[PDB]
């Protein structure tokens, strides 16, 4: 019973402190200080620093879908780096309700879904939890509790034909509001009155979809803003998305992807 030194420097008094340090039975072992096989090594293994998430195939794409039928994508088994937040390109907005993007890197998440669509300039606000408008009633509805990140930017040059890009449409007339994240892609004839018109688009029967008028010589308010909505969820098996962290060798204390586990 010789050689018990002072592990730390924090002044303690009359508090029994269990400590895991190197002592003489030098070897690692745990001691109780008065004022069973011990893990001989600690190893950590995170996914290799390659194989990044296809943020390009979501942000830099040829065509985004219309808002009535948005495009949903699931990215997983990648080391996501969140360098998008820097305005490397034009980035009008960056909201990130519920989770801090700055400190987001250190955490390990599950299947961050990305939703992409094109909307008009005024209505970008309506993509928020607790909005009431044509977009957030019949086209795309956000849950009351949201843990994601709304990204919107302007691209006048790609979406404004001098004739007019009329290929972008949205749903105007619907029977009832949309449950969170429900896509209702239909081309029925809305019965706005007691006229059984059997799909003839006559008096009191309209067509729900209606095009968007886009012109380069137009105001900022009526311009095409492309939007992408990152949605982070976490349930089980977090061995999917995991922020970049270095790893060690494999042989004990273990830390695998944040009774059987598959080494990434």
């Amino acid at each position, epitope marked *: 019973t010789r050689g018990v030194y002072y592990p730390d420097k924090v002044f303690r008094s009359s508090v029994l402190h269990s400590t895991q340090d190197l002592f003489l039975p030098l070897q690692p072992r745990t001691f109780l200080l008065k004022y069973r096989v011990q893990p001989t090594e600690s190893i950590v293994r995170f996914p290799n620093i390659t194989n990044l998430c296809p943020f390009g195939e979501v942000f830099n794409a040829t065509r985004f879908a219309s808002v009535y039928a948005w495009n949903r994508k699931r990215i997983s088994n990648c080391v996501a780096d969140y360098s998008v937040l820097y305005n490397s390109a034009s980035f009008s907005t960056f909201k990130c309700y519920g989770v801090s993007p*700055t400190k987001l890197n250190d955490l390990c998440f599950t299947n961050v879904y990305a939703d992409s669509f094109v909307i008009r300039g005024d209505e970008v606000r309506q993509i928020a939890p607790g909005q009431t408008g044509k977009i957030a009633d019949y086209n795309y509805k956000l849950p009351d509790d949201f843990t994601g990140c709304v990204i919107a930017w302007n691209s006048n040059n790609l979406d404004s034909k001098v004739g007019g890009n009329y290929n972008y449409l949205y749903r105007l007339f619907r029977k009832s509001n949309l449950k969170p994240f429900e896509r209702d892609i239909s081309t029925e004839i809305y019965q706005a009155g007691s006229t059984p018109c059997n799909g003839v688009e006559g008096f009191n029967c309209y067509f729900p979809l209606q095009s968007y008028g886009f012109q380069p010589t137009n105001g900022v308010g009526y311009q095409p803003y492309r939007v992408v909505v990152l949605s982070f969820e976490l349930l089980h098996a977090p061995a999917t998305v995991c922020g970049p962290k270095k790893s060690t060798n494999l042989v004990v204390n273990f830390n695998f992807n944040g009774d059987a586990v598959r080494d990434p």
Partner: antibody
Amino acid sequence: QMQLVQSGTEVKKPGESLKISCKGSGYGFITYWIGWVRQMPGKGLEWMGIIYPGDSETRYSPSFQGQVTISADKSINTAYLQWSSLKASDTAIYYCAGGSGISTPMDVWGQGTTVTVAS
Amino acid sequence: DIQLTQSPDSLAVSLGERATINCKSSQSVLYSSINKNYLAWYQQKPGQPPKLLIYWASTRESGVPDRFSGSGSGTDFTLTISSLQAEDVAVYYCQQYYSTPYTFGQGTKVEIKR
């Protein structure tokens, strides 16, 4: 981590109009929701308001709702807290603190500017 | 809209002794989606702006020494200083950041004893 530098100390007589600036310097300042907090002498903090630079969405507190005005200027990355007619009870120290998102703890705090109203 | 409460107001302990501070909330501040308590602990020294200490009521910010620990669940949360030192005498605030407006704690003053 982008630091915030406050404008400075102002002494004013009752009945004046007062504008206080919070200046944000540093990289990554694309998502920082600026908020204001007032500390009366030797008392606890009391949160006042939160504004997003740019979009300018502004959320207030019920006690202070409409007493003061919080505005933001995006081009130079600044936030302004303005009193139309400050009274004699406004002598206190004000801190501007910037969160990284809605529902995120405030981690970067400006030095803070005292205000004195008296003869 | 959800007022908080702290206890005790003033606590005196000797150097190297434990220090427990309790924060009580009106309603549970647990976010269903991520299952993380939304509540933070702040330290303020006389004459300086406050500093973040604990966020999510269980995780420590970078550089904070191990001595400071945060625990609790439901509505009851506590901050424990395993061994107090000569630099920790200060005022501690518990803040909930679930929904606006963000209420603050009364503030607890930690002083040493002779």
